[PDB]
Amino acid sequence: GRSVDTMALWLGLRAVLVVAGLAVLLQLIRGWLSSKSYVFNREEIARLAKEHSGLDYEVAFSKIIVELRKKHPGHILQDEDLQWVFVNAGGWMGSMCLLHASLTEYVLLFGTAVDTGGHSGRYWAEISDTILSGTFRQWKEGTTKSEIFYPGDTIVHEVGEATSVQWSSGTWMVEYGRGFIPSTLAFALADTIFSTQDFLTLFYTVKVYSKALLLEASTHLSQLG
Amino acid sequence: GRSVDTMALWLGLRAVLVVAGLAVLLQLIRGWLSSKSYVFNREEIARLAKEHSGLDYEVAFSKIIVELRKKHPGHILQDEDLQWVFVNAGGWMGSMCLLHASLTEYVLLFGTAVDTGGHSGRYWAEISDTILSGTFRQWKEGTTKSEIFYPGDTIVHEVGEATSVQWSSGTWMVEYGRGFIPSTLAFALADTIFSTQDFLTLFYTVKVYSKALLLEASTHLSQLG
Amino acid sequence: GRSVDTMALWLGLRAVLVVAGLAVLLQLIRGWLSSKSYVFNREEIARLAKEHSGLDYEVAFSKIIVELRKKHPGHILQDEDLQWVFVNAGGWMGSMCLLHASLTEYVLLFGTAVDTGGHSGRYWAEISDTILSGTFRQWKEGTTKSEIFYPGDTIVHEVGEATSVQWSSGTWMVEYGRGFIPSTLAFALADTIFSTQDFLTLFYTVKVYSKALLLEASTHLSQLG
């Protein structure tokens, strides 16, 4: 009767429960025990972006790239490899210009020229966004109220945290990520696979990521010999 | 030539047509013949929520939970099992606090602190939402115009109906569902599987559902002996 | 160590790269070499829609359908086969009324009664939208700025181009598509498969497409004999 169907549904739900829980456990294990060698730190990136947040955001972009190259030679992509690529993730749409990426860190310019919003993703990485222009509304898990952030502010999405994110048209920011960067890739690509079907954008995305990894390997080789 | 390719495409479309049609038919068969034993009714929930819709929505939440426990002992989750869980479904993002769930009914608090919107889902269940705060825009199938609803109003999403739904930031409501509740689960989880990749949220969701089912079974056992 | 994991990740990224690149190449090959026999042209559709864009959009809809039937008998669906069907694609939600479809062309009425937005899709087809009412914000790839278009304006989404699109509530337009129309179908259906789970909407969609193809075949047969 209804009791048997309730029992069966409960058994299936418990199966899904243990699957999802062990997936979370494996994410934690891969992340906490991942290597932690860092070229940048989030305070450096945030201070650099905040200093230029009063400029036009594209002038700021350029000045930030020049300063990052000056202070971290061999770790920022060259001009020929810079490209704006759409990012469809968690139900929102923006675009990125990747400057640096390794297994443990990334640096990029991010933003959107449309009003958009959705899920932030949940992964073993600490992400920080410093607003150059626009507005960034963040809604944290377990609460019924959200906060707006403005140019000059830095939002820190912490390890294992999930939020709702919402950007107004014309919102541009500098983003630094630290942790187990591969664990973000799935989230970064899901809407491309299951929603937009935009395989040229996927091509561009994996292309620039591979170029950033190759730059880091080349610099590591040149500095060890 | 083009005639043969047109014929082939038409054949494939007819295949998809009969597949989708028989899926709809099976949904109807599972739903209409599902059991219909009810602890609540939608008018009771709607009147209770409308009475408190002039309060702050969190005060209303608390008073509604207390009254539901008083009038339906053994059918509302205890305080230790109440939790705000994100809900990513149909392209929109909100959050729920489940109070009751069985095979045939559910009761929850729902809302969002971001502007969001998307598909309502289509399933064999009658859903009713009573607005405590915010605005709820509903766009029904087969029409070119939408309607806004305000605090104190109840929206009834009827069995087999599909709509577009849109909520402004700070919109909170009391939701009651009646029908074949499992048939909603797929819709409730799809964006988590194929968009957000947030497996800890999936864990939380199946956890609270399983707790609600266990409460209902425990109460059924205590009342039959 | 970290060097080996970096190498492995780079190898996997290169695999994804060549897969996506050859998918794009196959899309280009199927599209460029597809047949190019056309019943309409985009200037005709755009001029007809622009002429009536000062009317109420539903009066415009009707007058446009009457004129299209008068000028292209046997290529527009009859009244009994006209239906508003929800379209969930690329993270946005609208609705369409298909008037014409073949392997190489389509004509439909499109719009939304909710604020929505997302990815435009990327396929080997040239799409043109003439706004009857509302606003259409378009954000092109490789730029950090978007443009708003108003009633009477035509937006041309070109072959292989990807954009972000955003419509305000009450935005209605006339859409003409030219190219390899099947290559759009995946994008048109993805959110239904992986997000909304709305199989009755999928039924309606493949039903009207099949009816349009059958009309075109019937007219081709009646005109060749």
Swiss-Prot record, chains A, B, C:
Domain notes: The C-terminal helices form a flat, hydrophobic surface that is probably tightly associated with the cytosolic surface of the endoplasmic reticulum membrane.
Record localization: Nucleus inner membrane; Nucleus outer membrane; Nucleus envelope; Cytoplasmic vesicle
Membrane disposition: Single-pass membrane protein
Record bears the keyword Ligase: no
Subunit and interaction comment: Homotrimer.
Site (Important for ligand binding): 129, 175
Region (Important for ligand-binding): 102-109
Lumenal membrane side: 7-10
Protein name: Sigma non-opioid intracellular receptor 1
Top-rank taxon, per record: Eukaryota
Any GO BP: lipid transport
Family: Belongs to the ERG2 family.
Membrane spanning residue stretches: 11-33
Other noteworthy facts: Sigma receptors are classified into two subtypes (Sigma-1 and Sigma-2) based on their different pharmacological profile.
